[PDB]
Symmetry: C3
Subunit: 378 residues, 3 copies
C-alpha cells in the first residue's frame, strides 16, 4: 500500500494517516548511510481523530517497512496545525542495545562472531543474517559499544552492505548485493539533468610506509628503526607522474607484504567521481538493481550501480534523484567527520591519562621490591 499506517507509541491504536502533504513527502536512502522518510501532515477533519497520536516514537508503516519517528515539529499558524515528521528506519533503533562486555586484546575475528557478540541477548527482537564471503579482520578490545556502532564497524571493516527487513538485518557483500537488471537510463528519454563531480586533490600514485618499531630504536638510525619499510608506486603513475603522499605508519605488523598491501590500501590513484541523475521514468528503481547508463553528449556508456536514492511519493509527480560512485562533498559530512575524530581523540587522551597514572603505579611497587632486595644485599 502506498499510504502511511500510523501506530501509536503504546501500540494501542493503529490507523491510516490521511491528508498527508504528498508533495512534501520524501524517502531518502544511501547505502550504509541512511534510510528515512520525511513529510508534513496538516490537521484536517479526516485525520482529526488520530492527529494527536502522530508524534515522537510512533511507528509508520510505508510500503511494508517500519520507520520510527525521531523528530516532530508541531506548528500553529492561525487555523492550520502542521507537523513536520521525520522517521528513520527501525533498524537504526538497534543502537538502543549496548554490549558492555569487552573482549580485551588483539584477536582475529570474522563477521559472524562480531555480529553474534553485538546482538547477544537482545530485548528488542533483533535478528541478523549473513549472505556472502568476508575476510578475517584483527581487532583490539572489541565491545563496550552499542549495537549500531558495532554494525557500522562491521560494515567498515568487512566491507559488507546492510539492508533491513524491518527488524531483521541482512549483511551482503558486493557480489551478492547488486543484481543486474535490463532497465536502463537513456539521455533525452527518461533523464533530465546529469551531473558529474570530479576531484583530484587526493590523486596520489606513490606512498612510503613503515612497520613496527624495533626494540633498539634509539640505538638505530633511519629506516633501520623498523623491520618493515616499503615504498609502493601505483601503475597509474605512468599517466599521472610521481605524486607521493605523506607517510603512513602502522605499528602492528612486521613483514613487508602486509605493509605493501596496507600502503596500497592507503592511497587513491583514480580521480574521485560522483554521478547524479534526475530520473523521470515509469519503471521504479530499487536499492540493489544495476542499470545501464547511455548518454552520448556526456560520453557515458556503462553499467551504474545505485548508491543513493531520493524518491518522492508516487502521487507527488516530482522527479527522482539517483546517485552512483559515492556522494558529493557536502559540509555537514565534513562536520560529522571532524566530530567523530574529536571523539576518538578525546577517548584516546582519556585512556592515556589512566595509562600514564598507572605508569607511576607500576614504578613505585617494583622500586620498593628491589630496594628491599638491595637492603637484603647489605
Amino acid at each position: 500500500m502506498d499510504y502511511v499506517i500510523i501506530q501509536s507509541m503504546d501500540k494501542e491504536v493503529e490507523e491510516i494517516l490521511t491528508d498527508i502533504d504528498y508533495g512534501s513527502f520524501s524517502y531518502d536512502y544511501e547505502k550504509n548511510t541512511s534510510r528515512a522518510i520525511s513529510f508534513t501532515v496538516n490537521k484536517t477533519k479526516q485525520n482529526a481523530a488520530i492527529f494527536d497520536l502522530v508524534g515522537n516514537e510512533a511507528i509508520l508503516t510505508y510500503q511494508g517497512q517500519q520507520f520510527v519517528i525521531k523528530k516532530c515539529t508541531p506548528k500553529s499558524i492561525g487555523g492550520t496545525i502542521s507537523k513536520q515528521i521525520t522517521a528513520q528506519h527501525i533498524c537504526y533503533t538497534v543502537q538502543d542495545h549496548v554490549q558492555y562486555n569487552v573482549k580485551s586484546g588483539r584477536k582475529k575475528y570474522s563477521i559472524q562472531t562480531v555480529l553474534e557478540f553485538a546482538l547477544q541477548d537482545n530485548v528488542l527482537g533483533f535478528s541478523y543474517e549473513i549472505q556472502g564471503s568476508f575476510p578475517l579482520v584483527e581487532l583490539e578490545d572489541l565491545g563496550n559499544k552499542n549495537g549500531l556502532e558495532l554494525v557500522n564497524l562491521c560494515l567498515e571493516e568487512f566491507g559488507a552492505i546492510l539492508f533491513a527487513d524491518n527488524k531483521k538485518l541482512y549483511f551482503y557483500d558486493e557480489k551478492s548485493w547488486y543484481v543486474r537488471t535490463e532497465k536502463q537510463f537513456r539521455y533525452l528519454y527518461n533523464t533530465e539533468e546529469v551531473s558529474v563531480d570530479t576531484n583530484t586533490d587526493n590523486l596520489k600514485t606513490e606512498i612510503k610506509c613503515y612497520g613496527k618499531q624495533k626494540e633498539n630504536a634509539d640505538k638505530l638510525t633511519g629506516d633501520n628503526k623498523y623491520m618493515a619499510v616499503v615504498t609502493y608506486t601505483s601503475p597509474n603513475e605512468a599517466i599521472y607522474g610521481k605524486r607521493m603522499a605523506n607517510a603512513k605508519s602502522d605499528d602492528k605488523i612486521t613483514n613487508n607484504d602486509d605493509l605493501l598491501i596496507f600502503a596500497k590500501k592507503q592511497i587513491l590513484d583514480v580521480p574521485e567521481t560522483a554521478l547524479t541523475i534526475a530520473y523521470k521514468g515509469k519503471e521504479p528503481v530499487s536499492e540493489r538493481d544495476v542499470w545501464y547508463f547511455i548518454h552520448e553528449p556526456m560520453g557515458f556508456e556503462t553499467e551504474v550501480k545505485v548508491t543513493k536514492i531520493k524518491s518522492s511519493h508516487p502521487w507527488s509527480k516530482k522527479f527522482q534523484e539517483i546517485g552512483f560512485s559515492n556522494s558529493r562533498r557536502d559540509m555537514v559530512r565534513i562536520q560529522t567527520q571532524i566530530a567523530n575524530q574529536v571523539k576518538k581523540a578525546s577517548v584516546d587522551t582519556n585512556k592515556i591519562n589512566s595509562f600514564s597514572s598507572i605508569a607511576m603505579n607500576a614504578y613505585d611497587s617494583r622500586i620498593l621490591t628491589e630496594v628491599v632486595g638491595v637492603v637484603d644485599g647489605d
Copy 2:
C-alpha cells in the same frame, strides 16, 4: 528612556544617538548565554556631530543598561554612510580580568568562595551578589582563568542564573529567579506562531557506570576492577522500554550511592522539547516572569518560564520572539561545542606531555638511587 545614549571610549562626550534605524534594532537575551543589542545607524544631519564617536569600545545606555560595542561595520554606498553596531552587556567585559593564581588539588568549594576568588582585586569595578541556596562542588586546581570563564563554571556547576545590573552581577537559583505573574499567553489573542521542536535521539532509560579503579586491577577480572559498578534504570522505561546508553566512567568516587546519582545525572529520559512563541501583545515581558500558556489546538495549558527573548524596539512595530525549555539545535552552537572540546583536548595533551616528561624526569633520579643502593650492596 527608550532612546540610546552614546558615551565615547574616553568618556569625554556623552550624547543621544538619534536617527537610529529602529526597524533594524533588536535586543537578544538568553539565560546564561547572551545579552546584546544590535542595530544600524545612518549618518544624517541630526547625528552628524557625534557620528564619529560611535565605534568600537564605546558605551551605549539603553533602558538603563550599559552595553559595550564589540563590532562596528562602517559602510559607504554613495552618499549614505551606515554603521552596523553590535554591543554586548558590560558584564561580559569581566572577561578582561584573569585570576592567575591556582588552588591546586581537589577541594570542595562553595559558590561564595569561587566567586570571591574570581573577582579578587578587580580594577574594573565589578561586584557580585548571591541570592539563593547552592550545594558544594568539588573541583580540581581552580584558577588560571579569566573572570568570565570562572563565572560560566559557577553557572554550570552550582546551577545558578546570572543577571547583571550594569557591573553588579547577581547570582540566583531556580527558586528565587523566576517570579510568577498574572500575565498569560493566549491562542488567537496575543500570539501568532507557536512552534515546538521535539527530539528523541538521546532518549535513554538505562545506564551502566563504573567507579574508581582498584589498585590490583590488572590481576582482577570484570567489574571487580572497580569498587563501584552500578546499573541505573529510569522509571520512564515502563513507557519507553530498555534503551541502554554508552557506559560513562568516573574515576574519582568509590562508593555506590554517589555513582548512582552520577549515573542518574548522566542520562536524559524525556523527549527534548523547545517551545517558541511569537507574541504581539501590549504587556511587556521581562527575563524573570513566568506566564500561563493556553493553546487549545496544540494541547497546551501550563506555566511557561521564559528562557530566551528576541525583542524589538518599542517603535519598531515588529513582533517578539520568546523561548521556553531550552533552544533549537542550530549549527553555530554545535561548532562552539566542538571548538571548546578541541581546546580541552589540546590542553589535556599539553599537560600530559609535561606529565610524561616528568615521568622520565622522576625516572632517572630513582635509577641513580637504585644504582647507589646496588653499589652499597656489593
Copy 3:
C-alpha cells in the same frame, strides 16, 4: 593574451579555449593563501573539437600563468553541456613532493636551509629564489612533510611572502614585496562600496608568561617553579586600561628577555580591522602595488597595501574587489583552523602513545639492572 590556452593532461594537444562564459570568469588571489581561476564553459560548435580535453589535471594558461584544473563538473540540461572549471596555480602542485627524511632535534635554521631541504631532488621541475632578509628560527625534527607544508611553515615562521612565476617560487619579505605606485583610490571617482570590519573581542593589553620548568618544580612553590616569569603590559593600556589575557607558557626558553618578546608577540593591542573596496577604474591593480586611499566621509587618507584581489575577466564589465589588512571572519576559515588543530592533536596523541609505551619499555631494562644488582649484593 586575455584568452585561455588549454593544454591536455598528456600535453599532446594545446589549443585556445573559446566560448568561455566570461561573465562567470573570476580570478582570486590572497597573499600566502590562495591563487586560482574559476569559470564555466559551454559546449558549442567553436569548441566542440576540444571540449572533451578540458578536464581534471589539464593546464590552463592565462595572462602567462599556468593553472592546474582541480575540480571539473560536467553538467547536461537538455541540449547544453556545461563544465564548471576551477584551477589552482601550479605552484601548489609542489605538494606532490614529500621530504621523508627528518632532521631530528631542536636546531636553528635559516629560510635558505629549510627551502633547500624541502625542494631537494625534485622531479617536478620546481625551483626557488629568495629576495630579502629573514631571521633565524629554531625548529624541532624538521621534515616528514610535503613541499607545500614546508613552504607554508616557512611563510608562517620567517614572515615571508610567496609569489610564483609558474614553477619558480620567489620568497620576498615585507620590505621588498610591496612597491609604491602613484595610482590612488578616490571616493566617488573609481570606488563604489567601501566596507570596514572592526573587531575588539581579542583587545588585550596585558599578559603573563612562564618560561621553562625547574627540575625541583614539585619541591618549589609559585612562580619559583619557572626560571623565567614575566608580565608584559602594552602602552596601549593608556587608551584601553588593563585587559589581561589567559597566560601562555613556553617551555623552551630560560631567560627573561626571550619570554618578554614572546609575550609581546602573544597578544594584540589594536582593534582588528579589515578593509574591502569595490574598484571600477581603468588602471589595473597588481598583487604588489601600494595605493593611496582617500575617502573623506569615512575619514580615510592613507596608504593601503593590497592583500586580496577578486578580479573579473577584462571583458566581463564587472567590478573588482580588493582587500587590505587581512580578511573578514567567515566560517570556512574557522572550520579549517579547527580541522588543522584536530590533526595536530591527533598526531600529538599518536606520538605520545608510543612515548608512553617506550616509557614502559624503558622500565624493564632498569628493572633488570635492579635485579642484577640485588643478586650481586646478596
